[PDB]
Design a protein around this ligand. Sequence first.
Ligand SMILES: OC[C@H]1O[C@@](CO)(O[C@H]2O[C@H](CO)[C@@H](O)[C@H](O)[C@H]2O)[C@@H](O)[C@@H]1O
Ligand SMILES: OC[C@H]1O[C@@](CO)(O[C@H]2O[C@H](CO)[C@@H](O)[C@H](O)[C@H]2O)[C@@H](O)[C@@H]1O
Ligand SMILES: [Mg+2]
Length: 580
Amino acid sequence: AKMAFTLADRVTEEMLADKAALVVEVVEENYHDAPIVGIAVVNEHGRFFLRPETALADPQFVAWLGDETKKKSMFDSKRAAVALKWKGIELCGVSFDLLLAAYLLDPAQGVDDVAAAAKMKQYEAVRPDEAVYGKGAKRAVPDEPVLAEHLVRKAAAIWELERPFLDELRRNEQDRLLVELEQPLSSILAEMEFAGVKVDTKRLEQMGKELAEQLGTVEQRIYELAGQEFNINSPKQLGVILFEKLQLPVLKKTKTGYSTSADVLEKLAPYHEIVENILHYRQLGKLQSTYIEGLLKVVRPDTKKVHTIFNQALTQTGRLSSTEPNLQNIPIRLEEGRKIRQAFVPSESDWLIFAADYSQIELRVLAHIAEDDNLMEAFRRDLDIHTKTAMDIFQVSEDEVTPNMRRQAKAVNFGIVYGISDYGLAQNLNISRKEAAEFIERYFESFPGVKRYMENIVQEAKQKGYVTTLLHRRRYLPDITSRNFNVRSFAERMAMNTPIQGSAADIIKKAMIDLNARLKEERLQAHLLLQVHDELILEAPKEEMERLCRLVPEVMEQAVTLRVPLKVDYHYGSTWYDAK
DNA sequence: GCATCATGCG
DNA sequence: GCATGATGCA
Ligand SMILES: OC[C@H]1O[C@@](CO)(O[C@H]2O[C@H](CO)[C@@H](O)[C@H](O)[C@H]2O)[C@@H](O)[C@@H]1O
Ligand SMILES: OC[C@H]1O[C@@](CO)(O[C@H]2O[C@H](CO)[C@@H](O)[C@H](O)[C@H]2O)[C@@H](O)[C@@H]1O
Ligand SMILES: [Mg+2]
């Protein structure tokens, strides 16, 4: 049962073949400046295990790692690449990443280790990482004999599985998606994460002080209005104060009691002065806990930078996700929270932050896919799409569109991209199911192509078992055939939404690749820092702004060619906040 | 660890 | 529609 391999004490030529499955193991979940615990190499000559302090000090091995002509097959190459970057070592030649391959074949599998990807092809001669390392804090690196065999078995699985995975990707028409989009993007994300974003800690601390002061005042006021103290952060204790001691009406409940969601308190506001204070308390509380205290906990004490990790193989639609910290959900809606962005500054003196965002990319993608004449014309005229929708569904001229009409039309546009149900829209606009249904019907009468698309995509999902995006990303929807209305409807909404949200993801990902190629050709110092679904944030010398003002929008606008143009807005400033 | 709440794009 | 993080409670 045991797998044979050479536990080498030194690097040999045999280990430097031009094709190999490579494992550069980083156990710590956050791989930034993290230890490399072992290395495994499997190639035509055999299976090998190398101690990191040995291999990484070896000139020949380091050169092999950085030789683009020496191809390597790996699992989560970004993790290895970044861990190596922190050690001043360059990893090149990665031609196949099993994590990304598994992710494209089926995002729903949740593949997060070699064992999980291998099980997809009935290969089980490798143990799950959790089984070897354990979970929680009790997660430690085992003794060399156990560690070495595990790394070798993972390398062996990768070595064996590359062909079958590539073959299936090819069958799915996803070969270029892996090789020309996701794998090249992985390297770009690695550079972004490694570069990090500089944070003005002093600014954050000051804000923390001011918030703590405002919180104390709002908190005290709340007890003053309740006639007693209690844990406002406790939905249980709060519910007792609102619906029992204060007798506020119950407009909706929760599984474990009464509902105190923002959707509820907003309606209870007129009944008691305490509600507005609770909502405000929650706003400030979120800024203090997650964006002030939380951000400060992950800022590197020396460089004062934060190094997020973009999970490239998690979302069911093809989007990236961000953690430790999540730099894709920094406040911007409310001024008080938007101020947080003043804390994100350029990493060098005399540099500025440049941000470019796609304008209505999802609705433009919908116009393209549905080939709706009315919607395509609206974007060809670059009209305010919400005002346009209002004009159509409410049957009025532009001058007759009131602010309330535009607000409701905007809610309709948000919901249409995922076939929002009448109940879903009714809740968002706080109206009846019938009224919401009338809005939707009015929308379909004005945009018949979109109605046709929603009908056709659901049927396609049922016929094929999955839906696809512009660049051939796919998502299986087995629930589309369920006899349970709720479960089936949810699958139907996913069928309508995935091609839209997914294609928008495809487009910005390609723009990122195209952009880096352009920056390199022009030898600009500018570089990417973050991506937030519809936007790209970079930093660069103040002397490069004029060139970026022309280059970035163009690359993003020309990433793909649709039936409607793509529009990109951009801003730059001394801080992320100022890049508006 | 599940539930509820907040934040982002839409 | 798609995400992450902090909190309370058990
Ligand atoms: O390295 C990122 C890559 O690893 C996975 C597991 O294979 O996620 C791990 O690392 C993330 C970043 O620290 C953690 O959020 C996650 O909990 C941990 O398992 C993949 O999901 C990801 O693509
Ligand atoms: O009236 C048909 C209409 O209903 C939807 C759901 O909104 O689909 C239902 O009917 C289809 C048969 O035409 C089934 O395939 C599907 O499973 C069922 O939910 C729309 O897609 C369709 O336009
Ligand atoms: Mg935008």
